[PDB]
Every structure is written in structure tokens, then in C-alpha cells.
Amino acid sequence: AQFPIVGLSSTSYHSPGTQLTGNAIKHAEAVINIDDKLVSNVFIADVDEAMNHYD
């Protein structure tokens, strides 16, 4: 997923007779790559289940 980010400006004086061109406000972004799958597992034999006294 991408998060765009914005924000800049400028201020200046003007001389009469000339043409204003522009000032550029350029952006960037933040990306969050998705990780792999976390797991948590266990194996219980039936010998231990049969020999046990609780669940």
C-alpha cells in the first residue's frame, strides 16, 4: 500500500512588466510491504493423550 505525502510553497516579490512562471511543489510516498505468514503450531501424540490425566 502507498501513502502519498504533499506540502511545500514559496513567497517572493514581483517586478511589474514580467510574467510569473511558477514554483514546483513535488511529492513523495511511503510504502508498507506485506510480510510473510506468521505461524504457531504443535503436535500432540495419542500415547501422551491416553496416558495423561488432564486436557
Binding site: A50, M51, N52, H53
Partner: protein
């Protein structure tokens, strides 16, 4: 011997084996190895428990 039969198990009219166009079939009973005499399964004390190692 007054007839000439139509042998319908012969492959053609020019063979010796009058069988071999017939099929071998399942008899209906399957044999298996005998069960040995287990005399020690009985003649001793048997108990059952629900949990534990001894």
C-alpha cells in the same frame, strides 16, 4: 455318432482345443491362512484402566 456338432468354443473350424473361447470364473469362496490356537489370551487375569503409566 450320427451328428456333426457346431463346436462354439473352437476359435475356427480348424482346431484341436474345443475349449479356450470360454472364460474362467470366480469360484465363490476365498481361502486364507489358518488361525493358530491362542490359548494364552484366555487363562489369565485381564484388567482395564483409564489413565496412568502403571
Amino acid at each position: 455318432a450320427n451328428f456333426t456338432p457346431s463346436r462354439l468354443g473352437l476359435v475356427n473350424n480348424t482346431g484341436t482345443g474345443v475349449k479356450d473361447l470360454f472364460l474362467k470364473t470366480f469360484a465363490g469362496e476365498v481361502l486364507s491362512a489358518f488361525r493358530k490356537a491362542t490359548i494364552f489370551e484366555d487363562l489369565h487375569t485381564v484388567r482395564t484402566i483409564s489413565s496412568g503409566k502403571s
